[PDB]
Amino acid sequence: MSLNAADAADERSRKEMDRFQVERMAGQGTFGTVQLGKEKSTGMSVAIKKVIQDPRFRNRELQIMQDLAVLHHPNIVQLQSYFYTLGERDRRDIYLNVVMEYVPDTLHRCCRNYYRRQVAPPPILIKVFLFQLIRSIGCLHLPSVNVCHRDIKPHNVLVNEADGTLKLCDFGSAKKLSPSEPNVAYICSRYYRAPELIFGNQHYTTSVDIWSVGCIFAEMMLGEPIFRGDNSAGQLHEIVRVLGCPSREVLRKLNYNSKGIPWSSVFCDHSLKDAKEAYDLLSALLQYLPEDRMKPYEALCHPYFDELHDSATKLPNNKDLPEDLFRFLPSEIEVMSEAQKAKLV
Numbered sequence: 001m002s003l004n005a006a007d008a009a010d011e012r013s014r015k016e017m018d019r020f021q022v023e024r025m026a027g028q029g030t031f032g033t034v035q036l037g038k039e040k041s042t043g044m045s046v047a048i049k050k051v052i053q054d055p056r057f058r059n060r061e062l063q064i065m066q067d068l069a070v071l072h073h074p075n076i077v078q079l080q081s082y083f084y085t086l087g088e089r090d091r092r093d094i095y096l097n098v099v100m101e102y103v104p105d106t107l108h109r110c111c112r113n114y115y116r117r118q119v120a121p122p123p124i125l126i127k128v129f130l131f132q133l134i135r136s137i138g139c140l141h142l143p144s145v146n147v148c149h150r151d152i153k154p155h156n157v158l159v160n161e162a163d164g165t166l167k168l169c170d171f172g173s174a175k176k177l178s179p180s181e182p183n184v185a186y187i188c189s190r191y192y193r194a195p196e197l198i199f200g201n202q203h204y205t206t207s208v209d210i211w212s213v214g215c216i217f218a219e220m221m222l223g224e225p226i227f228r229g230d231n232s233a234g235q236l237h238e239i240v241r242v243l244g245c246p247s248r249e250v251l252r253k254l255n256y257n258s259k260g261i262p263w264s265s266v267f268c269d270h271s272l273k274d275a276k277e278a279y280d281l282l283s284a285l286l287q288y289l290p291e292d293r294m295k296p297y298e299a300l301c302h303p304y305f306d307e308l309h310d311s312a313t314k315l316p317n318n319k320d321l322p323e324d325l326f327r328f329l330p331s332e333i334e335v336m337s338e339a340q341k342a343k344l345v
């Protein structure tokens with residue numbers, strides 16, 4: 001199961017590779033490949049990702065992963081190792097490999113497993129997942145971290161359904177934004193792209209990641225992406241078809257006249273006991289104007305999450321909620337408002 005020393009691109013890389021055994025392929029695709037392995041020293045399960053870097057774009061996977069590894073946040077993957085390997089199909093290619101703790105599934109597959117059985121995922125799972133996903137972007141967006149992920153989607157939100165845990169991963173597109181500096185607008189997967197990105201703004205803020213998270217909340221409750229456009233213009237049309245056309249002043253700030261569709265009509269879920277609360281939260285995430293979207297630490301205090309504070313609340317398999325849900329890092333606690341601290345800590 002040892003990694004092949006001959007594939008190492010250099011001595012540092014051979015030494016890092018000797019730390020890990022490979023067990024099996026977990027998944028593969030345009031991003032490259034992810035193997036399940038094990039750290040030999042600890043027995044710990046790791047995900048070994050061979051990174052394919054598109055040279056039309058700046059890839060910051062390694063540098064952001066190294067910045068975030070200082071924090072050890074419970075809802076962000078933690079870098080264990082990085083090394084370079086020679087290509088298998090052509091040994092002149094060299095690839096970055098990043099090693100992090102293994103998470104068994106993607107949010108995409110976990111949700112698709114329910115919908116392929118004609119049922120929405122259990123409401124308590126959608127809720128603990130959303131809580132942890134909002135926590136991950138709260139941490140990213142702290143003034144001391146200031147990372148905009150820019151590509152949050154159900155394929156890079158990882159989950160362990162059995163314990164209700166969630167981790168954000170895939171920082172190749174992430175960047176520290178500045179109101180004074182420009183960025184590529186064609187970033188993000190189309191269905192998750194915020195209105196300000198659709199309009200081609202080169203200056204934007206971390207609120208783009210709040211929009212993506214709102215999109216994902218809706219997707220967990222619907223079974224498909226909520227805003228499925230065929231292109232930049234189609235994307236804006238699908239958003240307005242669902243949300244309602246925004247005022248002319250809103251559209252001029254970002255740069256048909258739809259009434260929009262009530263959430264109750266979109267999701268067709270009359271069993272969800274706290275739907276009014278869920279849909280209030282979703283509307284607060286999906287504000288057209290970035291400055292109007294509910295900020296993560298405040299969203300964590302939203303009444304939708306109240307039952308996550310009760311010890312009697314269990315996951316669908318009768319397991320306790322994750323122990324780290326309300327374990328916040330000092331860098332988070334120290335910038336909370338008194339009300340957020342009272343509620344969450």
Ligand SMILES: OCCCNc1cc(-c2ccnc(Nc3cccc(Cl)c3)n2)ccn1
Nearest residue numbers: 026027034047101102103104105155169170
């Ligand atoms: O589409 C899945 C995410 C691919 N990108 C990715 C994935 C990871 C990552 C980290 C930890 N555990 C896993 N598990 C896992 C499980 C099934 C399939 C696949 Cl492929 C992976 N993946 C990190 C950065 N980037």
